[PDB]
Amino acid sequence: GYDLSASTFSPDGRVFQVEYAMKAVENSSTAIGIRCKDGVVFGVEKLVLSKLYEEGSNKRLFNVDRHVGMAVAGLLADARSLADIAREEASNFRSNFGYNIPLKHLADRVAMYVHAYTLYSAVRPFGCSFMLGSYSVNDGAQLYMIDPSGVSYGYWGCAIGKARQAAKTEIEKLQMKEMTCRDIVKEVAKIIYIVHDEVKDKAFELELSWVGELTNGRHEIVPKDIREEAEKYAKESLK
Amino acid sequence: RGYSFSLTTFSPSGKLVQIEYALAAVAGGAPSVGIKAANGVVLATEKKQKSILYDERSVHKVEPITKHIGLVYSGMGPDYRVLVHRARKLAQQYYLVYQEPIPTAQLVQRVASVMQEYTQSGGVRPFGVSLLICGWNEGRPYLFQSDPSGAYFAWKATAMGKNYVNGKTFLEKRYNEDLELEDAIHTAILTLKESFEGQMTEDNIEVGICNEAGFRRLTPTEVKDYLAAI
Amino acid sequence: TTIAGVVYKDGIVLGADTRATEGMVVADKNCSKIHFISPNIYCCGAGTAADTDMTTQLISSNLELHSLSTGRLPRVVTANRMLKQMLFRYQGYIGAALVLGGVDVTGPHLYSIYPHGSTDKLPYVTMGSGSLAAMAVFEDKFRPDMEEEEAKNLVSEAIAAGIFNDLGSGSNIDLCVISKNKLDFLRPYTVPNKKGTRLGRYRCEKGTTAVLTEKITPLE
């Protein structure tokens, strides 16, 4: 059989171990990112698998540098490992070159690390996809997404996980180029509620973060009161 | 890390089949010919050259190792480039110690030894090439072949690649001890014409020669001249 | 040692004396100090003799591997980089002081290379214990764009200045002339010093030396 190692091509030129790792991401609940006029906003549908867990447990949103947020889907231990790689890369860049890593370069460096795990029988591919978001006055708003193959692209809007396509079709309805982060958080919450399958998985927490002019280029959790207002807007919009 | 186990092993009948299969890659390669004349050696090869789009001058199958030694092959081109690089390095290492150009037979022994390694060492396949190596030293020409096992042989004349069995019998009924280099070049090109298919130009064969003055590729214009008779 | 080089209208002239010393004794009267790098590049050496020989041989060898690969004539910059990076790595412990000259696709180039790994790209240079004598000649007489014969005269004058004024330098003058069209390795160029003749004969006849034991071993 042709699907047991990342160092084996199938007869049609596929690497099935990388495809299987992608299926782990596609079984995960949905995360979205949206770039707008003055920043980037992340939202995650965080399935609560037990009421015994604390609010906040198993975060899927990370700070990887002071100016860079990361949003993940897939196998969470793999994602955390990648967040640590992203953090080390940002730190090392600052030590060596003396300034904050540009988002695109950070995306490309971590993507090459992901890519290195798709060539060998000695290791397996990462079972995670992740988005990286930043803002600065010089570079503007940037949103990148990286998948288990190590492909990296930039986006206006992005979704990963199991309701990816349904999320993208809602994201396409927004004129995000002309909206502010404060406007977009409500729309992120709205979209998560739309694609959430309330019959099949019973309980979720909405996780929100942002980076933009309004945070002075620092990646930060959306404040509690703004999150609750966005949820309330999303829920009533569902009606 | 690297796989540390051999990928070539003995079969129940005592064969190293990976080496046999490496020889089948050689047998399906483009034809090569070497002829040792009295006063020199000629190496010649067919280009597996489809398109007019190829820049024929951009890569060479006939290559210098030193001022006085050259090589051609049949089989897998990229494997050949490895061996060319190692042969050049082996020749220079010898020169640094002894301050004398490496004797042709010494260079063949060291290159053949590298090929042997790849039949036993961990996590690698053998080379899918056989080499024809020419040189001049001690006032005399040398022609050697080195196979994927690391076995080497000295020849007066031989053929390798596609249709080699026939090419060897063509040379058997045509080579003589007292033959000159210019005549040898002609019979080498005739040997390739036996199995060519395409119409020969100076752009789809490559010829190298070795004599007292050293090893060099013939130029397109020189090959054109030899092709007028053929 | 006195070694020197000049850039002239169409090329490079390199020069060297032929004395090697051990302390204040002449060990070699006819040492060759102008070393092959590639067919278009040569290098004079001063300092520790084993280090100049081995360093130039190694670089020449690595350059031949380079040119075999590229299929092109090597560049003088490439020899310069290779030499200086190796010498820097050894922190001055390799006592090679070099005058590197050649002619490549970008024309003539001349460099001095020091043991610690600094290099200077210049139209005339000198090195060795005779280098200030040779440099005085150059400062007094160099002109840009000299003709071949003028440049050859100037280099041999400069080497001669070192030969006659430095106790470390002596014997013959060797030159190497490099242009786009020609390489003239002139060893010797001049022989300005000659051993005087022997006045008495000391041809000792057989039996002059008393012998305790003898064994003849015949060979094939």
Next chain:
Amino acid sequence: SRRYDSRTTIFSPEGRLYQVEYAMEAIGHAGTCLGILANDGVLLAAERRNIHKLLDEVFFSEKIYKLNEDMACSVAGITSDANVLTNELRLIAQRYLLQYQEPIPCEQLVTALCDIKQAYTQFGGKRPFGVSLLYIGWDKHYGFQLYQSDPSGNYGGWKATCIGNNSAAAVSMLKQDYKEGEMTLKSALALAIKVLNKTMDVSKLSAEKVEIATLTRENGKTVIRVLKQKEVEQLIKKHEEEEAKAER
């Protein structure tokens, strides 16, 4: 990676080492190679496989190797593997001479190489070397000597022995004709040609098809020589004259 490892250094259920046994099948197919010990010397005689018309002839032999001043060997099996081992033999012999300032005794050289072959059957996961060797030599402890080693790293000393094609038949002929304590180089040469004449039964025997080397002592020094073709044809003549006597 466990899926692709053919596990060359493990036991089979009957306590066997398959790769060693298979390498021994390779050797059985290679050129016949015999050694014969005499009172005044030792010899090696080998079938040549390099016999095509167009071959060039550049070395002094095909399968006979000088190891040091006092020793030579011949090989049957994979040629490239033989080149590795014979290079290692020469190194071992020079390491000894460096250390002790005397030649390595024959059995000590054989044993040293056999320990390398043994290691390849026990650890490292590599294929063994596909070579058997006959060693001839003189040393000051046991004089003229002949040894045989195989890919298991086993060896033994012999008065006469054969490896390679038709070994079993060759050994029977030696068993019957060899005179313990009474052989000379001249009669060992006759017997070698007799044996090769029967075991190269595809087909008629010729000087182009065999290689003979002798090891003797002359004026306190060891002489190792590869017989010229003139001499080999003369011995073939004498054997053919001798078979004309066989009945009346």
Next chain:
Amino acid sequence: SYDRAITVFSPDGHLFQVEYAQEAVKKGSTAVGVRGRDIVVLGVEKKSVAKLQDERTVRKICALDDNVCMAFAGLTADARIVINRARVECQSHRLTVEDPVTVEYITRYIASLKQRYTQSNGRRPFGISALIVGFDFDGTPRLYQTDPSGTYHAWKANAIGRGAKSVREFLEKNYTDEAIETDDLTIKLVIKALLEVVQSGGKNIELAVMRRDQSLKILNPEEIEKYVAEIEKEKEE
């Protein structure tokens, strides 16, 4: 470096490589040891005969040091490795303790070498068992046996290799205070034990003795056939 786990457990607690190593030993030539009162004796079968063999070069009995020797059965190349390792170790002991090894010390060393090759990556077990004999500082005679697992025990007498089962049965019935009262009878007891299983008796028994302080004496075919006749003519009575 090759790090494959070669010796592993199977269901039911078997170590198959070790069991297969023991199969190798069982196809080796028979070897026998008896511990006398003030002598120890080793004898071994065959192996091939073969007139054109130089006999000296294939002995299966080996000095480890002045006061310790061994015989083996199984893979002869493997045995040569073990023997040389044990010879090195005997010289370390002398170096650091300034006494010769006890027979138990070097046995324990050989056994733990064997055990390590059943539990280390990249290696197969040694396909040999050994009989190890000699004398301790205080004159006490010793006979130990090791096997591929690394297990070892002391014995009054023992056999390893092919036909060890029946040779051991013979020894169990024939080893008494009477049969080892002297040196000649101890030696004969070993020859009788071999001459049961030994194909074309014999001919191809190799035999060696060690006396208290006296170092290893191997017997020659003339000295062996003296004993053979001296037992064969006694078995008519």
Next chain:
Amino acid sequence: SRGSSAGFDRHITIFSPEGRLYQVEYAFKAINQGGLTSVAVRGKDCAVIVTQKKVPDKLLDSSTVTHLFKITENIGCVMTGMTADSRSQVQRARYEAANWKYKYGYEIPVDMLCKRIADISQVYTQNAEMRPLGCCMILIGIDEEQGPQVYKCDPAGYYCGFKATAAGVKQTESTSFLEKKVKKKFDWTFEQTVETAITCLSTVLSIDFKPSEIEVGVVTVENPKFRILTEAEIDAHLVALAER
């Protein structure tokens, strides 16, 4: 023989009975998984690279979707096949070129850079533990003696210089189109190089492009620095073509 297989010869890079490397063959199929085709052509004055630019998703920032890469100031490339493999090979090329300049004091020749990448790919065809990269690299640059250069290397470690070449799904069809066009040309050389490249790509795909559906890169003898055309620059070529 004829498609025969023994042991693990379809899983790792060991020889099949015919002397094939199936895993290397399969890396060539991987190049086509991307669904894209690239073309490159050289004349006396310039060399050009043209490739398809597919942006199916509206939510992509299309300025980040490219297969054209600067290797050095003077060497450009187009990558075809698996994207992450391609990026890795671009990084390696960049590293090799920079290292060459540091060690030798002059810019790496295009032929040498292509050879080096090919030699690195060769290793993956002989060592069992890693797969080949399922991508193909085409390099362009100006050589001071030989003029504009186009070089291509592949997952087998083969490489060659070309008058023109192609990669990806319609490689074979592009090769025929380019072959037929050069035979007509005197001294077998292309003259209108950007137009040949775009026409070839447009014929073999049957598309008739908008300026946002292709990317174009160039090096010229007068301007050796690798340059990427803008949309408007590309549009001028598309309009000049449309009008004869």
Next chain:
Amino acid sequence: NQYDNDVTVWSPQGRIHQIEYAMEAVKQGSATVGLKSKTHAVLVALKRAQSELAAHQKKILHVDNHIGISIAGLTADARLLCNFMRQECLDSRFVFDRPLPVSRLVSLIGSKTQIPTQRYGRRPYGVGLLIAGYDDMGPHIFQTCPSANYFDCRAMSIGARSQSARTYLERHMSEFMECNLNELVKHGLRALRETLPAEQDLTTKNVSIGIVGKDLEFTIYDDDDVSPFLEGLE
């Protein structure tokens, strides 16, 4: 099947069977319960005894003055992980002269335990932990898994028949934050007791207790010292 022997082999469903199998090692361990109030974090563990004459396996381990753990699964993996935790705590006191925050220690476990899940020939850790701690952010209960995931918990139970314990803990968890220590430990014991066969009861031989809080370094109670907590389950 072809997908279940190597931690490096993804199945076609996007799962890693070796990790799932490692999690079965924890489900078959004896049950343990962890819970917290505003001021204390408690661990309660059932100890399995091989025979009637064996002591009963330790389930609760000291990590630092402010941290202790309860284990389920392979005991040797539990010790290896506990030794790693101890060392990380010692390092933090050595360098910074203050206790390692509990959430940072748990992150270090996640990162350490993830590594062998991605390399050929390595295996997951076959142990699950309940971690009780107290720091500047108050009491904590964390859970760690062989998948290298971890969870921040109001309360938790792992091991055999722990579903029953979890059901009890959900039923009463609105009470925990305001409980005095005695009330909180009683709740832990009642949860653990739900895991038992109907015949059998909590005794001083089979219950082990661990407690840490604002005024109390991590302390283990066994044998006669658990009696105060068991009397008055009234």
Next chain:
Amino acid sequence: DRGVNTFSPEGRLFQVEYAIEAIKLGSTAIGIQTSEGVCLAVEKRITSPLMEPSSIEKIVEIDAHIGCAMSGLIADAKTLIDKARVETQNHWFTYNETMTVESVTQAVSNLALQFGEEDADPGAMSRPFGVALLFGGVDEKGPQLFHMDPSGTFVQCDARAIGSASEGAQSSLQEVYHKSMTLKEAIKSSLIILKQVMEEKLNATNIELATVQPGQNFHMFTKEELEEVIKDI
């Protein structure tokens, strides 16, 4: 074939489970802890009258206050025993005190799962140890008996049997054990039980017995002292 660090679907390491099955091929050993000391008793399992019975050593001294009885693949036990000895001497060297029985057992038990073929040194352990161990001794906690198996699980026991007949022997131990039992009673009980479970007729040469007491160091019973205890049994 699969790797040595593969979990089964039930959450166990195959290699460890298989090593546990190897313990059942060993001779029976018994340990009993009393307030007056611990005793260790083991079946020798003699396979030929030509074998020297004193060369079978299945009970060993670790230190003056600690003995160890083993069952299973005995050759495997040597490195564990040596590690125990070295550890107690290190502890003495460093701390000038005796190491507890529990601590010794713990140190040895940390070797248990240190096997595998792609983390470790050029020829590290390829498999677990096919050995079970009873450590019996006296420290400031008083007399103590600990059991360890190839999983690296260790635990204190009042009485425990290991090896071929351990079921059987463990049942008789439940029947006869009591917390206030004397050492002399424990010694008799363990010989009575060995006598039942052994295939051979028990005698003074085919068993070994040792004690450790608060007064007295590790003591192997002599032939003559075994004969005395055997009279009643």
